[PDB]
Amino acid sequence: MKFSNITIKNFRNFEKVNINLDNKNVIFGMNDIGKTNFLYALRFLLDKEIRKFGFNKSDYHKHDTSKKIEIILTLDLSNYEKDEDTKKLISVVKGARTSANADVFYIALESKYDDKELYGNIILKWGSELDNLIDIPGRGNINAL
Amino acid sequence: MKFSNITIKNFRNFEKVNINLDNKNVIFGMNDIGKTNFLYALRFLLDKEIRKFGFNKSDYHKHDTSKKIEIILTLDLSNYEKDEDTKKLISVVKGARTSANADVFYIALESKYDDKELYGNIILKWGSELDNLIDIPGRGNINAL
Amino acid sequence: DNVFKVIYINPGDGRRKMLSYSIYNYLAKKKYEDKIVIYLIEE
Numbered sequence: 001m002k003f004s005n006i007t008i009k010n011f012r013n014f015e016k017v018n019i020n021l022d023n024k025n026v027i028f029g030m031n032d033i034g035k036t037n038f039l040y041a042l043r044f045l046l047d048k049e050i051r052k053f054g055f056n057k058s059d060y061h062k063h064d065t066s067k068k069i070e071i072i073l074t075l076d077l078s079n080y081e082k083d084e085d086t087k088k089l090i091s092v093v094k095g096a097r098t099s100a101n102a103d104v105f106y107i108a109l110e111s112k113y114d115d116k117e118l119y120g121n122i123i124l125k126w127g128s129e130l131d132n133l134i135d136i137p138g139r140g141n142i143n144a145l
Numbered sequence: 146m147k148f149s150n151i152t153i154k155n156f157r158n159f160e161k162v163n164i165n166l167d168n169k170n171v172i173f174g175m176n177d178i179g180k181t182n183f184l185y186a187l188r189f190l191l192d193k194e195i196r197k198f199g200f201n202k203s204d205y206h207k208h209d210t211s212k213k214i215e216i217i218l219t220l221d222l223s224n225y226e227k228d229e230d231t232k233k234l235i236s237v238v239k240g241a242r243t244s245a246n247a248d249v250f251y252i253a254l255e256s257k258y259d260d261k262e263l264y265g266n267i268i269l270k271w272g273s274e275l276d277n278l279i280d281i282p283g284r285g286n287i288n289a290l
Numbered sequence: 291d292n293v294f295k296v297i298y299i300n301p302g303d304g305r306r307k308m309l310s311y312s313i314y315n316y317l318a319k320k321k322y323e324d325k326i327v328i329y330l331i332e333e
Protein backbone atom coordinates (compact mmCIF):
# COMPACT_ATOMS: atom_id res chain seq x y z
CA MET A 1 0.00 0.00 0.00
CA LYS A 2 1.40 3.40 -0.94
CA PHE A 3 0.21 7.01 -0.99
CA SER A 4 0.46 8.36 -4.52
CA ASN A 5 -1.10 11.81 -4.90
CA ILE A 6 -3.19 14.46 -3.17
CA THR A 7 -5.17 17.20 -4.94
CA ILE A 8 -6.46 20.18 -2.95
CA LYS A 9 -9.02 22.61 -4.41
CA ASN A 10 -10.27 25.85 -2.77
CA PHE A 11 -9.11 25.03 0.80
CA ARG A 12 -7.57 28.09 2.57
CA ASN A 13 -4.51 29.38 0.67
CA PHE A 14 -4.56 26.50 -1.84
CA GLU A 15 -6.60 27.27 -4.94
CA LYS A 16 -5.59 24.25 -7.06
CA VAL A 17 -2.56 22.19 -6.02
CA ASN A 18 -1.41 18.66 -6.87
CA ILE A 19 1.30 16.95 -4.78
CA ASN A 20 2.76 13.49 -5.34
CA LEU A 21 3.43 11.64 -2.09
CA ASP A 22 4.90 8.52 -0.49
CA ASN A 23 4.74 6.78 2.89
CA LYS A 24 7.35 9.13 4.43
CA ASN A 25 6.79 12.81 3.58
CA VAL A 26 8.71 15.89 4.79
CA ILE A 27 7.15 19.34 4.26
CA PHE A 28 9.24 22.51 4.41
CA GLY A 29 9.04 26.12 3.31
CA MET A 30 8.82 29.74 4.40
CA ASN A 31 6.63 31.44 7.00
CA ASP A 32 2.90 32.05 6.25
CA ILE A 33 3.18 29.76 3.23
CA GLY A 34 0.77 26.96 4.19
CA LYS A 35 2.58 24.06 5.82
CA THR A 36 0.04 23.93 8.65
CA ASN A 37 -2.84 24.37 6.17
CA PHE A 38 -1.48 21.45 4.14
CA LEU A 39 -1.54 19.20 7.21
CA TYR A 40 -5.05 20.30 8.20
CA ALA A 41 -6.39 19.17 4.82
CA LEU A 42 -5.28 15.68 5.84
CA ARG A 43 -6.93 16.22 9.24
CA PHE A 44 -10.27 17.09 7.67
CA LEU A 45 -10.04 14.12 5.29
CA LEU A 46 -8.97 11.32 7.62
CA ASP A 47 -9.36 12.39 11.28
CA LYS A 48 -12.87 12.20 12.74
CA GLU A 49 -12.20 14.61 15.63
CA ILE A 50 -12.03 17.62 13.28
CA ARG A 51 -14.52 16.47 10.59
CA LYS A 52 -17.49 16.53 13.00
CA PHE A 53 -17.20 20.31 13.48
CA GLY A 54 -17.58 21.16 9.78
CA PHE A 55 -16.17 24.08 7.83
CA ASN A 56 -16.45 27.73 8.81
CA LYS A 57 -16.34 30.77 6.53
CA SER A 58 -12.58 31.11 7.10
CA ASP A 59 -11.74 27.69 5.59
CA TYR A 60 -12.65 28.88 2.08
CA HIS A 61 -10.24 30.42 -0.41
CA LYS A 62 -10.32 34.24 0.01
CA HIS A 63 -13.38 33.86 2.32
CA ASP A 64 -16.10 33.47 -0.35
CA THR A 65 -18.45 30.52 -0.22
CA SER A 66 -19.47 30.20 -3.88
CA LYS A 67 -16.73 27.61 -4.57
CA LYS A 68 -16.75 24.05 -3.26
CA ILE A 69 -13.92 22.37 -1.36
CA GLU A 70 -12.66 19.12 -2.89
CA ILE A 71 -9.77 17.05 -1.48
CA ILE A 72 -8.91 13.75 -3.23
CA LEU A 73 -6.32 11.23 -1.98
CA THR A 74 -4.96 8.44 -4.21
CA LEU A 75 -3.68 5.08 -2.92
CA ASP A 76 -1.75 2.38 -4.77
CA LEU A 77 -2.65 -1.23 -3.97
CA SER A 78 -0.25 -3.10 -6.26
CA ASN A 79 1.32 -5.18 -3.46
CA TYR A 80 -1.80 -6.96 -2.13
CA GLU A 81 -0.11 -10.39 -2.06
CA LYS A 82 2.63 -9.34 0.40
CA ASP A 83 1.30 -6.46 2.54
CA GLU A 84 -1.35 -6.78 5.25
CA ASP A 85 -2.42 -3.11 5.15
CA THR A 86 -3.89 -3.61 1.67
CA LYS A 87 -6.16 -6.38 3.03
CA LYS A 88 -7.07 -4.02 5.89
CA LEU A 89 -8.27 -1.57 3.25
CA ILE A 90 -10.04 -4.11 0.95
CA SER A 91 -11.94 -5.89 3.79
CA VAL A 92 -13.93 -2.67 4.53
CA VAL A 93 -14.41 -1.42 0.91
CA LYS A 94 -15.71 -4.82 -0.34
CA GLY A 95 -18.20 -3.49 -2.91
CA ALA A 96 -16.88 -0.42 -4.73
CA ARG A 97 -13.84 -1.78 -6.61
CA THR A 98 -14.58 -2.14 -10.31
CA SER A 99 -12.02 -4.15 -12.27
CA ALA A 100 -10.59 -7.51 -11.27
CA ASN A 101 -7.06 -6.08 -10.85
CA ALA A 102 -7.79 -2.52 -9.70
CA ASP A 103 -4.54 -1.21 -8.23
CA VAL A 104 -5.74 2.34 -7.51
CA PHE A 105 -8.12 3.70 -4.89
CA TYR A 106 -9.59 7.16 -4.31
CA ILE A 107 -10.82 8.76 -1.08
CA ALA A 108 -12.47 12.13 -1.64
CA LEU A 109 -14.02 14.99 0.33
CA GLU A 110 -16.52 17.52 -0.99
CA SER A 111 -17.96 20.53 0.78
CA LYS A 112 -20.63 23.05 -0.20
CA TYR A 113 -21.72 25.93 2.03
CA ASP A 114 -25.16 26.66 3.49
CA ASP A 115 -25.81 30.39 3.90
CA LYS A 116 -28.98 30.09 5.99
CA GLU A 117 -27.38 27.65 8.43
CA LEU A 118 -23.93 29.29 7.83
CA TYR A 119 -22.50 25.78 7.85
CA GLY A 120 -20.10 23.80 5.71
CA ASN A 121 -21.09 20.14 5.51
CA ILE A 122 -18.43 17.53 4.72
CA ILE A 123 -19.38 14.60 2.49
CA LEU A 124 -16.83 11.81 2.03
CA LYS A 125 -16.68 9.29 -0.84
CA TRP A 126 -14.43 6.36 -1.88
CA GLY A 127 -13.97 4.01 -4.87
CA SER A 128 -11.73 2.74 -7.67
CA GLU A 129 -12.81 5.09 -10.48
CA LEU A 130 -12.66 8.88 -10.35
CA ASP A 131 -16.02 9.39 -12.11
CA ASN A 132 -17.88 6.70 -10.13
CA LEU A 133 -17.35 7.54 -6.46
CA ILE A 134 -20.09 6.28 -4.14
CA ASP A 135 -20.93 7.57 -0.67
CA ILE A 136 -19.36 5.97 2.38
CA PRO A 137 -21.91 4.02 4.45
CA GLY A 138 -22.22 4.86 8.12
CA ARG A 139 -24.57 4.55 11.08
CA GLY A 140 -24.69 7.37 13.61
CA ASN A 141 -21.38 9.11 14.29
CA ILE A 142 -19.25 6.31 12.76
CA ASN A 143 -18.56 5.72 9.07
CA ALA A 144 -16.36 3.04 7.57
CA LEU A 145 -13.07 4.96 7.23
CA MET B 146 -48.20 20.06 18.29
CA LYS B 147 -47.89 18.51 21.74
CA PHE B 148 -45.35 16.33 23.54
CA SER B 149 -47.09 13.35 25.10
CA ASN B 150 -44.58 11.02 26.73
CA ILE B 151 -40.88 10.38 27.26
CA THR B 152 -39.42 6.96 28.14
CA ILE B 153 -35.86 6.87 29.44
CA LYS B 154 -35.05 3.17 29.34
CA ASN B 155 -31.38 3.35 30.32
CA PHE B 156 -29.27 6.40 31.26
CA ARG B 157 -27.13 7.57 34.19
CA ASN B 158 -29.67 7.72 37.02
CA PHE B 159 -32.65 6.03 35.37
CA GLU B 160 -33.46 2.31 35.35
CA LYS B 161 -36.95 2.44 33.74
CA VAL B 162 -38.55 5.91 33.71
CA ASN B 163 -41.80 6.81 31.89
CA ILE B 164 -42.99 10.43 32.22
CA ASN B 165 -46.13 11.93 30.72
CA LEU B 166 -45.35 15.35 29.27
CA ASP B 167 -47.00 18.45 27.80
CA ASN B 168 -45.92 21.73 26.31
CA LYS B 169 -44.65 24.22 28.97
CA ASN B 170 -43.40 21.80 31.62
CA VAL B 171 -41.47 22.36 34.85
CA ILE B 172 -39.37 19.71 36.64
CA PHE B 173 -38.46 20.03 40.32
CA GLY B 174 -37.34 17.89 43.23
CA MET B 175 -34.64 17.30 45.84
CA ASN B 176 -30.91 17.82 45.41
CA ASP B 177 -28.69 15.17 43.76
CA ILE B 178 -31.28 12.76 42.31
CA GLY B 179 -31.81 13.56 38.60
CA LYS B 180 -33.43 16.46 36.69
CA THR B 181 -30.32 17.70 34.87
CA ASN B 182 -29.90 14.21 33.45
CA PHE B 183 -33.50 14.72 32.37
CA LEU B 184 -32.31 17.80 30.49
CA TYR B 185 -29.27 15.91 29.16
CA ALA B 186 -31.64 13.26 27.77
CA LEU B 187 -33.23 16.02 25.68
CA ARG B 188 -29.87 17.49 24.64
CA PHE B 189 -28.65 14.07 23.53
CA LEU B 190 -31.81 13.55 21.45
CA LEU B 191 -32.42 16.93 19.82
CA ASP B 192 -29.27 19.10 20.17
CA LYS B 193 -26.60 18.23 17.60
CA GLU B 194 -23.63 19.70 19.50
CA ILE B 195 -24.13 17.39 22.48
CA ARG B 196 -25.00 14.41 20.25
CA LYS B 197 -21.80 14.61 18.17
CA PHE B 198 -19.51 13.42 21.00
CA GLY B 199 -21.23 10.08 21.64
CA PHE B 200 -21.67 8.26 24.93
CA ASN B 201 -18.99 7.37 27.48
CA LYS B 202 -18.89 4.46 29.93
CA SER B 203 -20.21 6.76 32.69
CA ASP B 204 -23.46 7.45 30.79
CA TYR B 205 -24.64 3.87 31.46
CA HIS B 206 -26.54 2.77 34.57
CA LYS B 207 -24.18 1.70 37.43
CA HIS B 208 -21.31 1.34 34.87
CA ASP B 209 -22.89 -1.94 33.69
CA THR B 210 -22.17 -1.25 29.94
CA SER B 211 -23.90 -4.40 28.57
CA LYS B 212 -27.34 -2.79 28.25
CA LYS B 213 -28.74 -0.54 25.53
CA ILE B 214 -29.44 3.15 26.09
CA GLU B 215 -32.88 3.93 24.65
CA ILE B 216 -34.60 7.33 24.81
CA ILE B 217 -38.02 7.54 23.12
CA LEU B 218 -40.00 10.77 22.68
CA THR B 219 -43.70 10.60 21.73
CA LEU B 220 -45.26 13.56 19.86
CA ASP B 221 -49.05 14.06 19.43
CA LEU B 222 -49.93 15.38 15.92
CA SER B 223 -53.72 15.15 16.32
CA ASN B 224 -54.49 18.73 15.24
CA TYR B 225 -54.11 19.12 11.47
CA GLU B 226 -54.47 22.38 9.45
CA LYS B 227 -54.48 24.50 12.64
CA ASP B 228 -50.80 24.68 13.67
CA GLU B 229 -47.80 25.23 11.41
CA ASP B 230 -45.47 22.99 13.44
CA THR B 231 -47.24 19.76 12.42
CA LYS B 232 -46.65 20.61 8.74
CA LYS B 233 -43.04 21.40 9.69
CA LEU B 234 -42.71 17.87 11.05
CA ILE B 235 -44.55 16.04 8.21
CA SER B 236 -42.73 17.88 5.36
CA VAL B 237 -39.37 16.47 6.57
CA VAL B 238 -40.42 12.96 7.78
CA LYS B 239 -41.73 12.08 4.25
CA GLY B 240 -43.61 8.73 4.36
CA ALA B 241 -42.08 6.82 7.31
CA ARG B 242 -45.59 7.41 8.70
CA THR B 243 -48.75 5.49 7.82
CA SER B 244 -52.28 6.74 7.11
CA ALA B 245 -53.80 4.24 9.58
CA ASN B 246 -51.98 6.00 12.45
CA ALA B 247 -52.01 9.65 11.37
CA ASP B 248 -51.84 11.01 14.96
CA VAL B 249 -48.75 9.81 16.93
CA PHE B 250 -44.97 10.09 16.26
CA TYR B 251 -41.99 8.35 17.89
CA ILE B 252 -38.44 9.72 17.82
CA ALA B 253 -36.12 7.15 19.37
CA LEU B 254 -32.46 6.92 20.36
CA GLU B 255 -30.51 3.68 20.72
CA SER B 256 -26.93 3.16 21.89
CA LYS B 257 -24.79 0.05 22.39
CA TYR B 258 -21.22 0.06 23.68
CA ASP B 259 -18.59 -1.08 21.18
CA ASP B 260 -16.15 -2.27 23.93
CA LYS B 261 -13.13 -2.42 21.56
CA GLU B 262 -12.74 1.23 20.54
CA LEU B 263 -14.52 2.11 23.87
CA TYR B 264 -17.22 4.30 22.35
CA GLY B 265 -21.00 4.32 22.53
CA ASN B 266 -22.48 5.18 19.13
CA ILE B 267 -25.83 6.95 19.01
CA ILE B 268 -28.24 5.67 16.34
CA LEU B 269 -31.45 7.70 15.92
CA LYS B 270 -34.69 6.28 14.41
CA TRP B 271 -38.18 7.78 13.82
CA GLY B 272 -41.53 6.17 12.97
CA SER B 273 -45.31 6.16 13.41
CA GLU B 274 -45.36 2.77 15.16
CA LEU B 275 -43.15 1.73 18.08
CA ASP B 276 -42.20 -1.50 16.39
CA ASN B 277 -40.63 -1.09 12.89
CA LEU B 278 -38.72 2.15 13.43
CA ILE B 279 -36.50 3.06 10.48
CA ASP B 280 -33.29 5.11 10.62
CA ILE B 281 -33.15 8.88 10.22
CA PRO B 282 -31.41 9.64 6.89
CA GLY B 283 -28.38 11.90 6.84
CA ARG B 284 -25.84 12.96 4.25
CA GLY B 285 -22.71 14.09 6.11
CA ASN B 286 -22.68 15.44 9.66
CA ILE B 287 -26.19 16.84 9.02
CA ASN B 288 -29.20 14.78 10.12
CA ALA B 289 -32.77 15.16 8.93
CA LEU B 290 -33.83 16.02 12.50
CA ASP C 291 10.90 48.58 40.60
CA ASN C 292 11.78 52.25 39.95
CA VAL C 293 15.05 51.14 38.28
CA PHE C 294 14.66 47.89 36.33
CA LYS C 295 11.97 46.91 33.85
CA VAL C 296 12.05 43.23 32.86
CA ILE C 297 10.54 42.12 29.55
CA TYR C 298 10.06 38.34 29.49
CA ILE C 299 9.46 36.79 26.06
CA ASN C 300 8.29 33.19 25.66
CA PRO C 301 6.47 32.14 22.45
CA GLY C 302 -1.04 31.71 11.14
CA ASP C 303 2.26 31.48 13.00
CA GLY C 304 5.79 32.82 12.70
CA ARG C 305 4.78 36.38 11.79
CA ARG C 306 2.84 36.76 15.06
CA LYS C 307 6.07 36.19 17.01
CA MET C 308 7.87 38.85 14.93
CA LEU C 309 4.85 41.15 15.44
CA SER C 310 5.14 40.52 19.19
CA TYR C 311 8.84 41.45 18.91
CA SER C 312 7.82 44.70 17.17
CA ILE C 313 5.22 45.38 19.90
CA TYR C 314 7.77 44.68 22.69
CA ASN C 315 10.49 46.81 21.05
CA TYR C 316 7.99 49.64 20.42
CA LEU C 317 6.85 49.56 24.06
CA ALA C 318 10.48 49.45 25.24
CA LYS C 319 11.35 52.42 23.01
CA LYS C 320 8.26 54.44 23.98
CA LYS C 321 7.25 53.76 27.58
CA TYR C 322 10.63 52.85 29.10
CA GLU C 323 13.08 55.66 28.36
CA ASP C 324 13.63 56.32 32.09
CA LYS C 325 14.24 52.67 33.04
CA ILE C 326 16.91 50.01 32.59
CA VAL C 327 15.35 47.36 30.36
CA ILE C 328 16.38 43.70 30.70
CA TYR C 329 15.09 41.27 28.08
CA LEU C 330 14.73 37.62 29.09
CA ILE C 331 14.17 35.59 25.92
CA GLU C 332 13.18 31.92 26.24
CA GLU C 333 13.94 29.94 23.03
Ligand SMILES: Nc1ncnc2c1ncn2[C@@H]1O[C@H](COP(=O)(O)OP(=O)(O)OP(=O)(O)O)[C@@H](O)[C@H]1O
Pocket residue numbers: 011012013029030031032033034035036037038058059060061062063302303304305
Ligand atom coordinates in the same frame (compact mmCIF):
# COMPACT_ATOMS: atom_id res chain seq x y z
N1 LIG D 1 -8.98 31.09 4.08
C1 LIG D 1 -7.80 31.56 3.68
N2 LIG D 1 -7.72 32.15 2.46
C2 LIG D 1 -6.55 32.64 2.04
N3 LIG D 1 -5.38 32.62 2.69
C3 LIG D 1 -5.48 32.04 3.89
C4 LIG D 1 -6.62 31.49 4.46
N4 LIG D 1 -6.35 30.97 5.72
C5 LIG D 1 -5.07 31.21 5.88
N5 LIG D 1 -4.48 31.85 4.82
C6 LIG D 1 -3.09 32.26 4.70
O1 LIG D 1 -2.28 31.28 5.33
C7 LIG D 1 -1.39 31.92 6.28
C8 LIG D 1 -1.10 30.98 7.42
O2 LIG D 1 -0.41 29.82 6.90
P1 LIG D 1 0.20 28.73 7.86
O3 LIG D 1 -0.15 29.01 9.27
O4 LIG D 1 -0.24 27.37 7.37
O5 LIG D 1 1.76 28.86 7.60
P2 LIG D 1 3.07 28.01 7.92
O6 LIG D 1 3.89 27.77 6.73
O7 LIG D 1 2.62 26.78 8.69
O8 LIG D 1 3.82 28.93 8.94
P3 LIG D 1 4.93 28.81 10.07
O9 LIG D 1 5.90 27.77 9.54
O10 LIG D 1 5.63 30.16 10.05
O11 LIG D 1 4.32 28.45 11.36
C9 LIG D 1 -2.12 33.20 6.66
O12 LIG D 1 -1.20 34.18 7.13
C10 LIG D 1 -2.77 33.61 5.34
O13 LIG D 1 -1.87 34.35 4.52
Ligand SMILES: [Mg+2]
Pocket residue numbers: 035036302303
Ligand atom coordinates in the same frame (compact mmCIF):
# COMPACT_ATOMS: atom_id res chain seq x y z
MG1 LIG E 1 2.69 26.68 10.99
Ligand SMILES: [Mg+2]
Pocket residue numbers: 180181
Ligand atom coordinates in the same frame (compact mmCIF):
# COMPACT_ATOMS: atom_id res chain seq x y z
MG1 LIG F 1 -28.99 20.43 38.83
